[PDB]
Design a binder for this molecule. Sequence first.
Ligand SMILES: Oc1ccc(/C(F)=C/c2cc(O)cc(O)c2)cc1
Ligand SMILES: Oc1ccc(/C(F)=C/c2cc(O)cc(O)c2)cc1
Ligand SMILES: [Cl-]
Ligand SMILES: [Cl-]
Ligand SMILES: [Fe+2]
Ligand SMILES: [Fe+2]
Lengths: 497, 497
Amino acid sequence: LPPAPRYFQGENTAGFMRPVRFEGDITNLEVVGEIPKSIEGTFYRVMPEPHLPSFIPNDPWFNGDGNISGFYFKDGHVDLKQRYVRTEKFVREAEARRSLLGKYRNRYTDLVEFKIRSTANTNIVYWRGQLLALKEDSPPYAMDPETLETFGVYDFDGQLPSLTFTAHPKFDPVTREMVCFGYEAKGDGTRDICYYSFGPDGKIAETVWLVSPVCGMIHDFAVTENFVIFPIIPLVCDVERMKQGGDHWQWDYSIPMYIGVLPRRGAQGSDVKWFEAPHGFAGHVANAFEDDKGHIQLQMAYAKDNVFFWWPDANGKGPRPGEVEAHFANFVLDYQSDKLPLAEPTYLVDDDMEFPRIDDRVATRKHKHTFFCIFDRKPGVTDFEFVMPRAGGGAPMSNGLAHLNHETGDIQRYLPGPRKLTGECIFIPRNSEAAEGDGYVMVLLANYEDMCSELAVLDTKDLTNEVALIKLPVRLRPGLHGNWVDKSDVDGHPAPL
Amino acid sequence: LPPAPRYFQGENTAGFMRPVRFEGDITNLEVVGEIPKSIEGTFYRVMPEPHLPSFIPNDPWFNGDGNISGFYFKDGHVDLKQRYVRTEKFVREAEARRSLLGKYRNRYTDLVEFKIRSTANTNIVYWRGQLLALKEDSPPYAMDPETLETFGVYDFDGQLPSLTFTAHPKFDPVTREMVCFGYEAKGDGTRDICYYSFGPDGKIAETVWLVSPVCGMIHDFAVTENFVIFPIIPLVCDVERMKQGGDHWQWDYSIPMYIGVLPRRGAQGSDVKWFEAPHGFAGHVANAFEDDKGHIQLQMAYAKDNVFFWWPDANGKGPRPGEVEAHFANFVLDYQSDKLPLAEPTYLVDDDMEFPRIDDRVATRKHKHTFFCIFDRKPGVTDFEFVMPRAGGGAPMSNGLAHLNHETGDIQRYLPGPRKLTGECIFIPRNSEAAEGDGYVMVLLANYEDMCSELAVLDTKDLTNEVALIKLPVRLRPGLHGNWVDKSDVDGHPAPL
Ligand SMILES: Oc1ccc(/C(F)=C/c2cc(O)cc(O)c2)cc1
Ligand SMILES: Oc1ccc(/C(F)=C/c2cc(O)cc(O)c2)cc1
Ligand SMILES: [Cl-]
Ligand SMILES: [Cl-]
Ligand SMILES: [Fe+2]
Ligand SMILES: [Fe+2]
């Protein structure tokens, strides 16, 4: 077998990116300031964190074992619980005491045959009394919200019709449905997309099979009252390339950014319309909604080149690290239109941004508040000379959060400091009668001075001030998505406005 | 109630001394070099580590909640498990989410009434299939060696005759007895010492009540074939002082360092002879044995002034931090002599030293190898300008280990480097046929450059070279005692040579 290294080497596991790999508890976290005493619930987040050194050099960040953190809040006190998802990969590698799964989404490089290749490392959501740890090449893994024990791969009582479950399901705050899909839904290289939904009682509602014009990456999607929308990143999969040891994904400069629109209820596969946006990268969706005219307003991060530069085109063509900016775009789509090309989007702000969140009480409906990560290169915002040598590589950087009020156009920015960077934020309603976007924002910080993590709590009335700073004595390696589960929401999701 | 701080403040919890307070697992630790594949067993260590900020300012290091680390070795792989002892203090404070126990060994300052005040933070030993977590003001707490679960306060099937159980019991390698005692054995300020022993079947053997000439601290003791030996530190307890909120211990410059000698078997309390060594501090015992003449050779760390400078005399008189050195002394004692004063000891080496260990296969018999911590002020051994600002306070410093061969007088020294300091080492026999002192040494390092801990593995054939360096991604705060439990030893202790 390729030899198993006994310590981590390479930029993707150096500095702040060095895996810690701890599971367990740290109760009664240290707090500077004061956590509002009325906050009650749990912030769950997932990070890729390789449990064992990979036999693949420079294995991307996206390929690390999912480790779940829960921060449990009550009466101004907070406890941390942390535990790895017991994926098939995790369990078999722990038994062997070495890495066995190979390149990102390429089973032809695995040292043993896996049934499920999930690292369950991308999102962690609440559904019907369980956590679902999500990875877009696989079904979810179900976990206990209290103990973080893994129950196992989850198939929705035998109803899951797809091999794949997106990391970005949407929760309709009025119908209480979970709206889902999977791409490559019949296996590696397939153009099959399975669109499906579950009612609040757990029964499958929609199931529609459709065909993507290319086998392209559909990382996120959008849901409105009457439509579902599938933006395709121009990364394309060729299984023959994979069989020779090549990458699952390869950029294609010759295609548009396709945007599929399907009717939300009762459609067939042939009802999808593949609109053609100008070539670019489909980033995360903030939210989509239908306006007065029935036109879809789709608000999402959008870049003009390949954000995932390590997967360049067939000739190795692509940008360099830190070159590509993504911007907060608004695309207008009309399902009734037969004109497939779309105009350049309008842009809501100037900032280089990503990881947008809204008040999920208006998900699928008109929203007027967005919170998002920003990366500002203006001199002095980040002390790059100090941070870069301690940061390692492989992951995006954010040096602030922004809050946009869409009615007024006011933007507030939270800057944690010159030697700190942020993860994705969560929004917590002040209480069940709070106005849209009124309450608290939490965000995990990487402090490069201390080489520790911190959890900042902010009030939306003034996003520039930390109400509390929870000081962890360990690093939580840069991670992906997270969600708030409020103690007053019996089904784990907030009530509609 | 005195207000409960929400983050740690003060020098005793700053820098490398900042509590981490994590419990759980880190498997498959990173290793540089190669752990000898034949090593099989577990290294257990205990550290004081306050679980909650104290309401007592500058609470000493000795007063922190005991947290147990186990490093489990097999086939060149090593896993960490870590867990707090579930003492009455730990459990009641965790329930209240605040500190409740007050000053070190002063129940009159507690905010609630405790039955048992143990922090179980001083030693962790193996006995008859359980771990015993030891603290000299209390009985032991029994724990599971595999899971580190706490079973509860342990009374030896109702046989424990004392309120107090020493942190330094001795294991006789020939008889397989555990030889114990407790001082202040009838309560705060009592001069009662209870000497007692257990046979390998768990039945109590000896129980002798004796009287100390003063209520002084008897931290360690020594055991030979026919005698037990009690060296008294000139810290003295006055319960009336404690009732007014004062310190349990106060130095007394007017007394000798008493050394009690009692016959090991069949004695009465009045058989003890209280020899009088020159005034000084009774440090840890390496080992004691009877020579050809039946005279006791007692080898121990010995200083000329109060090592515990924060507990000065009645008028506040005593040394400053880092001024007192302890040296490796040999006292000669003759139980038949009626001459109570003893000569100044001889010294085995020059180094400022402490935490001596021997090959416990010769415990209570003649030994010819000692391993110990040293603190060398020779310029450049420690880069004090770098280390001191990151170190915090409250704990002793060691910047090397030394191995003395007593037959030849050769000394080898392991220096982990200018920005590292060490804990107490353990010795592991190479195999069951190894000569005395031949095998491996392990020691936990504090790395002040990385602010992480490391576990060094050394071969006694060349103590200057690390065979392996196990790299933890967290800090283990400076700790107290630790022990090896070899997998090949049925009762957990090595066979006699
Ligand atoms: O297995 C995978 C595949 C993709 C991702 C992932 F987070 C993609 C992604 C990351 C970004 O920083 C922005 C963005 O729009 C998308 C994670 C795991
Ligand atoms: O409650 C307690 C009381 C004492 C100790 C302790 F380890 C004392 C000690 C520490 C030294 O550095 C040298 C030495 O000779 C003795 C630990 C906990
Ligand atoms: Cl589990
Ligand atoms: Cl327990
Ligand atoms: Fe995502
Ligand atoms: Fe000790």
